Design a protein around this ligand. Structure first.
Ligand SMILES: OC[C@H]1O[C@@H]2O[C@H]3[C@H](O)[C@@H](O)[C@@H](O[C@H]4[C@@H](O)[C@H](O)[C@@H](O[C@H]5[C@H](O)[C@@H](O)[C@@H](O[C@H]6[C@H](O)[C@@H](O)[C@@H](O[C@H]7[C@H](O)[C@@H](O)[C@@H](O[C@H]1[C@H](O)[C@@H]2O)O[C@@H]7CO)O[C@@H]6CO)O[C@@H]5CO)O[C@@H]4CO)O[C@@H]3CO
Ligand SMILES: OC[C@H]1O[C@@H]2O[C@H]3[C@H](O)[C@@H](O)[C@@H](O[C@H]4[C@H](O)[C@@H](O)[C@@H](O[C@H]5[C@H](O)[C@@H](O)[C@@H](O[C@H]6[C@H](O)[C@@H](O)[C@@H](O[C@H]7[C@H](O)[C@@H](O)[C@@H](O[C@H]1[C@H](O)[C@H]2O)O[C@@H]7CO)O[C@@H]6CO)O[C@@H]5CO)O[C@@H]4CO)O[C@@H]3CO
Ligand code: C8E
Ligand code: C8E
Ligand code: C8E
Ligand code: C8E
Ligand code: C8E
Ligand code: C8E
Ligand code: C8E
Ligand code: C8E
Length: 312
C-alpha cells in the first residue's frame, strides 16, 4: 500500500567531526599552513527498501585558518548536502540505479585585505551506477559514471566553474572475515575562472587517475578494521588564455594517500567510527614564470575523523 510504504524506512542519524592539518610548501619554498575543522551537526541516512530508495542529508559547519609569512586568512562556512539514490534490483546479483547529489556551501573570508568576502558554491553530481554480487564466488563490483558541475561565485574575486566526468570501477572479494578490493578511478574536467570584469584567470583542462587497494578485517567479537592506500596522478593543462603567467603552462601532480580506520557497533542501535588519513601530493610545472624559488609544490596533510550514528 502507498500510504503505509511511507512508514517503511530505516536508516540512521548521526554527527561527526573532521580535523584537517595541511602544510603546503609551494613554489616559493615557504610554508602555507592550514587547519580546518568540520562539525557535522546532523546527518540523516534514509533507506526505504519498499521504494528501493535511499536518501541522505547533512548539515556541516566549517572553519578554516590559513597562515603563512606575511599573510593570514580565515574562512567560516555552512555546507548542506542533499543526496538521492533510486535503485533497482535486476536479479541474479545485478542492480543499477541513479544518484543525484547537490551540495551547497556559503562562506565568508577574512584577511588583512578583505573583511567578510562572501563565497557561494553549488556542486551537482549525477551518477548512474551498476553493481554486481556473486554469492557463489563471494566476489563482486561497484561501478559508476559521473557528471559533475561546480559553480562558485566569489563576488569581488570573480566566478569559477568546473565541469566534467568521472568513472569508477571497484572489484572486491570476501573470504572468511576478510574483504579486499581495488578502486580504479578516472576523471576529466574543464576549469574556467574569470574576474568580475571578465578577465580570464584560468582556462584549463584537467585529468586524474588513481588506483586504491582496500583491505578490511571484521573481528568476530567486535568491529571492522580497514586500510586503504591510494597512488594517483593528475595534470592541469592551461590554454593560452589563462592569466597570471599560466598561459600554456602545465601542472603535473603525484598523489599518495594512506588511510586506517575502525568501525564498531555499540549495542543494537549505535555505531562509532574513527579514521586517520595521510596525504602527500607533489606538483611541478612545465615551465616556471620567473618568480618561483623552485619547481616543486608539496602538500602534506593529516586528517582525523570521528563519527557516531544512531540506527533505526
Ligand atoms: O556520495 C555518495 C557516497 O556513496 C557511495 O557509496 C556507495 C558504495 O560504493 C557502495 O559500497 C554502497 O555502500 C553500501 C554499503 O557497502 C555500506 O556499508 C553502507 O554504508 C554505511 C556504513 O556502514 C557507515 O559507515 C555509514 O556511512 C557513513 C560514513 O561512515 C561516512 O564516512 C559518510 O560517508 C561519506 C563518504 O565518506 C564519502 O566518500 C561519500 O560517500 C560516497 C562514496 O564515495 C560512494 O560513492 O559521502 C558519504 C556521505 O557524505 O557518511 C555516511 C553516512 O553517514 O552509513 C552507511 C549507510 O548505512 O551503505 C551502502 C548500503 O546502504 O552503496 C553506496 C551507494 O550509496
Ligand atoms: O594575499 C594574496 C595571496 O597571497 C598568497 O599567495 C601567494 C601564492 O601562494 C604564491 O604561489 C604566489 O602566487 C602566484 C600563483 O601561484 C600563480 O598562479 C599566479 O596567481 C594568479 C592566479 O593563478 C590567477 O587565478 C589570479 O588569482 C586570483 C585567484 O584565483 C582568486 O581566487 C583570488 O585570489 C585570492 C585568494 O583566493 C586568497 O586566498 C588570497 O590569496 C593569497 C594566497 O592565499 C596566499 O597563499 O587573495 C587573493 C586575492 O588577492 O584573486 C586572484 C587575483 O585575481 O591571479 C594570480 C596573480 O596573477 O601568480 C601568483 C603571484 O606570482 O604568490 C602569491 C602572493 O605571494
Ligand atoms: C538489463 O536491463 C535493465 C536495464 O535497467 C533499466 C534501467 O532503468 C531502471 C530504473 O530503475 C528504477 C526503477
Ligand atoms: C535527473 C537527471 C537525469 C539526467 C540524465 C542522466 C542519464 C544517464 O543515463 C546513462 C545510462 O545510465 C544507465 C542506467 O541508469 C539507471 C537509470 O535508472 C534511474 C532510475 O531513476
Ligand atoms: C535546507 C535548505 C535551506 O537552508 C537554507 C539555510 O542554509 C544556510 C546556508 O547553508 C548553505 C546551503 O545553502 C543553500 C540553501 O538551500
Ligand atoms: C550504469 C553505468 C555504470 C558503468 C560504469 C563503468 O565504468 C567502469 C588506472 O586508473 C585508470 C582509471 O580506470 C578506469 C576507471 O573505470
Ligand atoms: C563479471 C561479469 C559477471 C559474470 C560472472 C558470472 C560467473 C562466471 O564465472 C565463470 C568463470
Ligand atoms: C569482478 C567480478 C568478480 O565476480 C564475478 C565472478 O567472477 C568469477 C571469478 O572469476 C575469476 C576471477
Ligand atoms: C546534466 C545532465 C547530465 C546527466 C548525464 O550524465 C550521466 C553521466 O555521464 C564518461 O562519460 C562520458 C565522458 O565524456 C567524455 C567527453 O565528454
Ligand atoms: C576487535 C576489537 C579490537 C581489535 C582491534 C580493533 O582496534 C583497532 C584500533 O585501531 C583504530 C585506529 O583507527 C584510526 C584511529 O585514528 C582516528 C583518529 O580519530
Amino acid at each position: 500500500a502507498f500510504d503505509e510504504s511511507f512508514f517503511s524506512f530505516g536508516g540512521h542519524v548521526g554527527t561527526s567531526v573532521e580535523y584537517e592539518d595541511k602544510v603546503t610548501r609551494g613554489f616559493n619554498n615557504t610554508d602555507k599552513k592550514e587547519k580546518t575543522i568540520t562539525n557535522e551537526v546532523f546527518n540523516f541516512f534514509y533507506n526505504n527498501p519498499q521504494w528501493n530508495f535511499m536518501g541522505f542529508y547533512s548539515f556541516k559547519i566549517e572553519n578554516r585558518e590559513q597562515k603563512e609569512p606575511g599573510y593570514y586568512e580565515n574562512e567560516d562556512g555552512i555546507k548542506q548536502l542533499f543526496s538521492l539514490n533510486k535503485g533497482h534490483d535486476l536479479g541474479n546479483g545485478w542492480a543499477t540505479g541513479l544518484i543525484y547529489e547537490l551540495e551547497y556551501t556559503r562562506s565568508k573570508v577574512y584577511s588583512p585585505d578583505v573583511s567578510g568576502l562572501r563565497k557561494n558554491l553549488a556542486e551537482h553530481s549525477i551518477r548512474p551506477y551498476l553493481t554486481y554480487w556473486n554469492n557463489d564466488y563471494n566476489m563482486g563490483f561497484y561501478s559508476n559514471l559521473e557528471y559533475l558541475l561546480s559553480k562558485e561565485d566569489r563576488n569581488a574575486w570573480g566566478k569559477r566553474q568546473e565541469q566534467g566526468y568521472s568513472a569508477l570501477f571497484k572489484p572486491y572479494k570476501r573470504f572468511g572475515n576478510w574483504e579486499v578490493g581495488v578502486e580504479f578511478y578516472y576523471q576529466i574536467k574543464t576549469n574556467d575562472e574569470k574576474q568580475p570584469d571578465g578577465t580570464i584567470n584560468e582556462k584549463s583542462d584537467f585529468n586524474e587517475r588513481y588506483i586504491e587497494p582496500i583491505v578490511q578485517y571484521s573481528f568476530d567479537d567486535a568491529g571492522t578494521l580497514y586500510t586503504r592506500v591510494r597512488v594517483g596522478k593528475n595534470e592541469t593543462k592551461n590554454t593560452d588564455r589563462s592569466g597570471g603567467g599560466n598561459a600554456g603552462i602545465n601542472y603535473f601532480k603525484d598523489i599518495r594517500k594512506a588511510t586506517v580506520g575502525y568501525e564498531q557497533s555499540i549495542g543494537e542501535s549505535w555505531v562509532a567510527k574513527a579514521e586517520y588519513e595521510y596525504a602527500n601530493e607533489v606538483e611541478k610545472k612545465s615551465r616556471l614564470s620567473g618568480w618561483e624559488a623552485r619547481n616543486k609544490s608539496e602538500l602534506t596533510q593529516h586528517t582525523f575523523y570521528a563519527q557516531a550514528l544512531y540506527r533505526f
